[PDB]
Design an enzyme around this catalytic site. Structure first.
Site, PDB file in Angstrom:
ATOM      1  N   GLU A 117      22.001  93.113  11.846  1.00 21.25           N
ATOM      2  CA  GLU A 117      20.919  94.112  11.158  1.00 21.25           C
ATOM      3  C   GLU A 117      19.580  93.834  12.021  1.00 21.25           C
ATOM      4  O   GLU A 117      19.095  92.639  12.629  1.00 21.25           O
ATOM      5  CB  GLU A 117      20.490  94.114   9.990  1.00 21.25           C
ATOM      6  CG  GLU A 117      20.121  92.891   9.172  1.00 21.25           C
ATOM      7  CD  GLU A 117      19.601  93.094   7.930  1.00 21.25           C
ATOM      8  OE1 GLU A 117      18.532  93.921   7.562  1.00 21.25           O
ATOM      9  OE2 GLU A 117      20.021  92.405   6.705  1.00 21.25           O
TER      10      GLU A 117
ATOM     11  N   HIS B 221      22.082  95.903   6.892  1.00 24.99           N
ATOM     12  CA  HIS B 221      20.991  96.034   5.850  1.00 24.99           C
ATOM     13  C   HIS B 221      21.329  96.328   4.423  1.00 24.99           C
ATOM     14  O   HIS B 221      21.774  97.259   3.974  1.00 24.99           O
ATOM     15  CB  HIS B 221      20.066  97.183   6.353  1.00 24.99           C
ATOM     16  CG  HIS B 221      18.727  97.248   5.777  1.00 24.99           C
ATOM     17  ND1 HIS B 221      17.921  96.032   6.055  1.00 24.99           N
ATOM     18  CD2 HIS B 221      18.084  98.092   5.270  1.00 24.99           C
ATOM     19  CE1 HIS B 221      16.728  96.341   5.408  1.00 24.99           C
ATOM     20  NE2 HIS B 221      16.935  97.906   4.972  1.00 24.99           N
TER      21      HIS B 221
ATOM     22  N   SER C  26      14.623  94.610   1.342  1.00 25.31           N
ATOM     23  CA  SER C  26      14.311  95.652   2.375  1.00 25.31           C
ATOM     24  C   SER C  26      12.719  95.689   2.241  1.00 25.31           C
ATOM     25  O   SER C  26      12.148  94.407   2.147  1.00 25.31           O
ATOM     26  CB  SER C  26      14.689  96.974   2.383  1.00 25.31           C
ATOM     27  OG  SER C  26      14.567  97.484   3.715  1.00 25.31           O
TER      28      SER C  26
END
Length: 294
Positions: free
Chosen positions: A235, A265, A143
């Site tokens: 995502e 995610h 991320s």
């Protein structure tokens, strides 16, 4: 779609805070801590301090002497810790048969950009100083942490540090402008985004959102080592990974992008109940090990 992901999607939608309610930072941080998966009980851990930050060595069974992962955790540059990520990182240590260095790097808004990048660079420096050979090193993260992987390589390259054998961004957030089509295109499929802008605002604190070390999709990536990019089809950050891959190709970098159908995610983080989560982690370790043979 497997039954696990369907069930996980449903669970994630129930628990989500409705769109637009502003959750305070300290509430988000504590929530993330409270729901963190406990690591497998064969994972052991050793608390160290690195570049003025708390870290842990996270060592699954089967680790090779001499190899390491600099691991950079997600949390939008504003949250996440060693605790939130110890479980998943322990499984990456298992899959790659290498110990992971899990860094509690400085977080915004207390420490805005470029603090996290300085921390990652210094942590990499620390590993080289401990005597790990660059060809024995990998860098991975999810991320925010996955863009930071790229930010660290770039900054490190610019500072004359040698590149490690590989890098594995997982669902990387590599473009702080949050303008990619997929924020519209993938928004319905994504159970996990005006909250992503607040994070960007907190991290940047007035800095250029196209700064190469904030948003490595705009950086010169020439000389970076072979990349494995994992991203979920489902995502909002799909485009970050597609565009990262194209940038790397253009820049001469060896890049492999895997878009996993039906995945969300950092679906990796849900390895205890998600077969694809386990599979994707095994794949990350496989790639690290492949790159460590080449």
């Amino acid at each position: 779609a497997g039954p696990e992901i369907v069930k996980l999607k449903k669970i994630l939608r129930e628990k989500a805070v409705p769109p637009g309610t502003e959750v305070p930072l300290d509430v988000m941080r504590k929530g993330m801590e409270k729901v963190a998966f406990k690591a497998a009980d064969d994972i052991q851990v050793e608390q160290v301090t690195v570049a003025g930050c708390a870290a842990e060595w996270v060592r699954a069974p089967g680790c090779q002497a001499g190899k390491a992962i600099l691991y950079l955790h997600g949390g939008g540059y504003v949250m996440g810790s060693i605790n939130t990520h110890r479980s998943m990182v322990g499984e990456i240590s298992r899959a790659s048969q290498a110990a992971a260095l899990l860094l509690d790097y400085r977080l915004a808004p207390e420490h805005p950009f470029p603090a996290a990048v300085e921390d990652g660079v210094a942590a990499y420096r620390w590993l080289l100083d401990q005597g790990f050979k660059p060809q024995h090193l990998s860098i991975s993260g999810d991320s925010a942490g996955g863009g930071l992987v790229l930010a660290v390589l770039v900054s490190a390259r610019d500072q004359g540090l040698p590149m490690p054998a590989s890098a594995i961004p997982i669902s990387p957030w590599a473009d702080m402008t949050c303008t990619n089509d997929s924020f519209k295109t993938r928004a319905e499929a994504d159970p996990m985004p005006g909250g992503i802008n607040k994070m960007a605002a907190r991290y940047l604190n007035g800095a250029d959102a196209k700064h190469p070390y904030a948003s490595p999709n705009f950086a010169n990536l020439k000389g970076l080592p072979p990349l494995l990019i994992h991203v979920g089809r489902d995502e909002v950050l799909l485009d970050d990974s597609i565009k990262l891959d194209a940038k790397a190709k253009a820049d001469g970098v060896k890049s492999t992008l895997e878009i996993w159908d039906d995945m969300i995610h950092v679906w990796h983080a849900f390895h205890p109940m998600l077969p694809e989560g386990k599979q994707a982690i095994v794949r990350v370790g496989e790639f690290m090990r492949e790159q460590w043979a080449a």
